[PDB]
Design a protein around this ligand. Structure first.
Ligand SMILES: [Zn+2]
Length: 258
């Protein structure tokens, strides 16, 4: 099936997922000089105080922290969004080396990793209905810049040893995802897609300008995960990122003035 290797990686996803070459694919490069301020955007509201984390798991592509999304315990509203978007999971993308790893780029520059907090529009009742709609999902993208250790990531790093191979999971309760947000919520937004197959064009992307920190040591712990399942051959989980795709007939809008 699909992955990030030379034969099954992003350059070949279009064979089985022809939307890979569609009008609204992600990620993209963000040109800070040409992304224009949009005064119609409303203030972005992140409400995570009651978020309920459940489990952390290795799905053979990344690791996901899963949240209870049966109620409005953790929601995103405002900004470019109409309505209420519920948090279902977050996950990361990272590189084999600190100089690469992010999916979005900023003025063609890559960060060491990128965090995605995935939310779905409650007017569709269920995540599975939402992903079929152009306004179905909102993903909050946060860059990780190597520097000082990040205390808000350490609880994640501390459990990765328990989920080294595909299919493993662990209890992961009482994690506060507010600890992964920067202090400024200044952002860029554009309409796009999931960055993994099935690459559905159902996402309102909200990419924060301010990165969060991660130590070189913390990101090296991401790289100790494996793509493979136990009893299968070893494939270190590195470089699980899709390269940037053409902007085509879209506009990237800024929440803030240059
Ligand atoms: Zn992602």
């Amino acid at each position: 099936h699909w992955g990030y290797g030379k034969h099954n990686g992003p350059e070949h996803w279009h064979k089985d997922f022809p939307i890979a070459k569609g009008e609204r694919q992600s990620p993209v490069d963000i040109d800070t000089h040409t992304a224009k301020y949009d005064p119609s955007l409303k203030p972005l509201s992140v409400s995570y105080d009651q978020a309920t984390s459940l489990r952390i798991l290795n799905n053979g592509h990344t690791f996901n922290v899963e949240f209870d999304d049966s109620q409005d315990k953790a929601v995103l509203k405002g900004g470019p969004l109409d309505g209420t978007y519920r948090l279902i999971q977050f996950h990361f993308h990272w590189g084999s080396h600190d100089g690469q790893g992010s999916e979005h780029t900023v003025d063609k520059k890559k960060y060491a990793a990128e965090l995605h907090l995935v939310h779905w529009n409650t007017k569709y009742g269920d995540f599975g209905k939402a992903v079929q709609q152009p306004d179905g999902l909102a993903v909050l993208g946060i860059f990780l810049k190597v520097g000082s250790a990040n205390p808000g990531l350490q609880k994640v790093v501390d459990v990765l040893d328990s989920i080294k191979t595909k299919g493993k999971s662990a209890d992961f309760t009482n994690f506060d995802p507010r600890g992964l947000l920067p202090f400024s919520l200044d952002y860029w937004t554009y309409p796009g897609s999931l960055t993994t197959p099935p690459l559905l064009e159902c996402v309102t992307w909200i990419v924060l300008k301010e990165p969060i920190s991660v130590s070189s040591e913390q990101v090296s712990k991401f790289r100790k995960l494996n793509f493979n399942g136990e009893g299968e051959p070893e494939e270190p989980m590195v470089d699980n990122w899709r390269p940037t795709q053409p902007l085509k007939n879209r506009q990237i809008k800024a929440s803030f003035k240059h």
